[PDB]
Structures are given as C-alpha cells and as structure tokens.
Design an enzyme around this catalytic site. Structure first.
Site, short mmCIF file in Angstrom:
data_model
loop_
_atom_site.label_atom_id
_atom_site.label_comp_id
_atom_site.label_asym_id
_atom_site.label_seq_id
_atom_site.Cartn_x
_atom_site.Cartn_y
_atom_site.Cartn_z
N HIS A 54 1.28 -3.18 -4.45
CA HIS A 54 0.46 -3.14 -5.61
C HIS A 54 -1.03 -3.37 -5.37
O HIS A 54 -1.80 -3.07 -6.26
CB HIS A 54 1.08 -3.96 -6.74
CG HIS A 54 0.59 -5.40 -6.83
ND1 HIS A 54 1.27 -6.50 -6.38
CD2 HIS A 54 -0.58 -5.83 -7.39
CE1 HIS A 54 0.52 -7.59 -6.62
NE2 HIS A 54 -0.59 -7.22 -7.28
N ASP A 85 7.53 -4.82 -3.11
CA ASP A 85 6.09 -4.92 -3.11
C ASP A 85 5.53 -5.31 -1.75
O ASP A 85 5.10 -6.46 -1.50
CB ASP A 85 5.67 -5.84 -4.25
CG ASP A 85 4.20 -5.84 -4.55
OD1 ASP A 85 3.49 -4.91 -4.08
OD2 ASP A 85 3.82 -6.73 -5.33
N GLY A 126 -5.61 -12.43 -7.59
CA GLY A 126 -6.51 -12.34 -6.45
C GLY A 126 -5.85 -12.91 -5.23
O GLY A 126 -6.33 -12.67 -4.14
N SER A 155 -2.69 -11.85 -4.56
CA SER A 155 -1.63 -10.90 -4.25
C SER A 155 -1.77 -10.41 -2.85
O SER A 155 -2.89 -10.16 -2.43
CB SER A 155 -1.64 -9.73 -5.23
OG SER A 155 -1.29 -10.09 -6.55
N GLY A 156 -0.65 -10.18 -2.15
CA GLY A 156 -0.67 -9.62 -0.81
C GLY A 156 -0.73 -10.70 0.26
O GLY A 156 -0.40 -10.48 1.42
#
Ligand SMILES: *[B]1(O[C][C][C][N]C([N])=[N+])O[C][C]O1
Ligand SMILES: [Ca+2]
Length: 223
Positions: free
Chosen positions: A40, A84, A175, A177-178
C-alpha cells in the site's frame, strides 16, 4: 508511533525512510540490494533513505539511493490490504556499516507474547497530528490470533498479525506503514493498518512476514 520514545540515534540500522519529496512510509533493509515495505506504500518512483535518524537534518550517516525496481506481492489486495508486502531493489547496493545494516527474515512465525520493536516517523499523536523529525520506537508484544480476530471480527486474514496493547495508547500510526516489527533480531511484521491509532481494543495489524520467506527469496533470485 504513538506512546513510544525517540530511538537512540542509528540504533535501528535496518530502518529506512521512503521519500517522494518527503517521507511517506518506512521499510526494512533485508539485503544490501533490497528493502521490504508495505504494498500500500507503492509509488512508481521512490528514494530510499538509509542511516537516518533526523529525516530533516543531514547528520552524516545517510545514504540516499533511488529504487531501481518496485515489486508488489502479486496477491496484494488494495482494499482489504491482504498480502500487504512489496520489495524495492536499490539502484546501487547500500554500504553496510554500524548505522546501515540488514535484519534477518524469520526462522519461524513469532509466538504470542514475543517482545518486538516497532519503529518509524509516523504520527505521534492519538489526538490531532504531529510528525517527528527523529525516529520513534515502541516496545510491543505479538498478540494472540484470538485477541487479533476478536478486535477485528471477520477482517484478520492468515497474512495478518496483531502487535501492540489492547488497552490503547501505544501503537504505530499514519506514516509508519511499511516499517519494521523486529522480534529477537527477526523481521516478523510490516506496519500495515489499524482502525485509527492507539484506540482501545484496536491494536496495530501487521503483514505476517514469516508467510513470505519463499516469495522474498524467489523475488531476490529473479531480479
Ligand atoms: B500507513 O498507515 C499505518 C497505520 C497503522 N495504524 C495502526 N497501527 N493503528 O502509513 C502511511 C500510509 O499508511
Ligand atoms: Ca538525517
């Protein structure tokens, strides 16, 4: 990260910041040429910023390396966020030192109650917003699959784990994410989603990295 603390500078040497004009997502260095992040977070151009602590000041450990390839998991669902996960190949290898290091992929899936470290530059407020210059850290346990599914009835796939605190107050947020969830020196989670952040009985939901070791090794060998 809400309810966390500022990490010691460069103490999370596998954490990267993904930048497209500004920081927008986290990632984890897993090989000198590859970063794992959240599908995402995809954009067609990404600069990877390694060895950061202050994303607003050049402190002398940074390596800024453009992505050469960006590969989302073929079964990424943009709506549910199932699968994801994405891999970023760097246009040149990161040089590995004390401040820029790889993190191992999982030997096994983490048991409930395993202590982890979650990090990133995402929102630090549960009321309003504040985006940090300095990398934030949070100690958090893996939650039981029962707790996870009870918090989000019908929404937790086999590719999702919950990590955090059912009381609220301590979670990742927008912020982050990942970015990494690291437990006993292994990347077990990728920051994915939650219903708002740090709410009671809405723990952070993370991509279940131990499901993806084959895919990640396949992708690295193929590219
Ligand atoms: B990503 O959002 C992460 C939100 C995590 N929420 C939570 N743990 N309650 O960061 C930038 C884009 O999505
Ligand atoms: Ca910096």
């Amino acid at each position: 990260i809400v309810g966390g603390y500022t990490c010691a500078a460069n103490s999370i040497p596998y954490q990267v910041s993904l930048n497209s004009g500004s920081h927008f997502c986290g990632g984890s260095l897993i090989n000198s040429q590859w970063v794992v992040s959240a599908a995402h977070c995809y954009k067609s151009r990404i600069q990877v910023r390694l060895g950061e602590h202050n994303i607003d000041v050049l402190e002398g450990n940074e390596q800024f390396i453009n992505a050469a390839k960006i590969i989302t998991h073929p079964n990424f669902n943009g709506n549910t966020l199932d699968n994801d996960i994405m891999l970023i190949k760097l246009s040149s290898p990161a040089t590995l030192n004390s401040r820029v290091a790889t993190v191992s992929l999982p030997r096994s899936c983490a048991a409930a109650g395993t202590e982890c470290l979650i990090s990133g530059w995402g929102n630090t407020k549960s009321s309003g917003s504040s985006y940090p210059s300095l990398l934030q850290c949070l100690k958090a346990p893996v939650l039981s699959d029962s707790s996870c599914k009870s918090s989000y009835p019908g929404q937790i796939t086999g590719n999702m784990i919950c990590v955090g605190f059912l009381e609220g107050g301590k979670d990742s947020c927008q912020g982050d994410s990942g970015g990494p969830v690291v437990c006993n020196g292994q990347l077990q989670g990728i920051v994915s989603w939650g219903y708002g952040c740090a709410q009671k009985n809405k723990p952070g939901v993370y991509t279940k990295v131990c499901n993806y070791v084959n895919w990640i090794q396949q992708t690295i060998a193929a590219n």
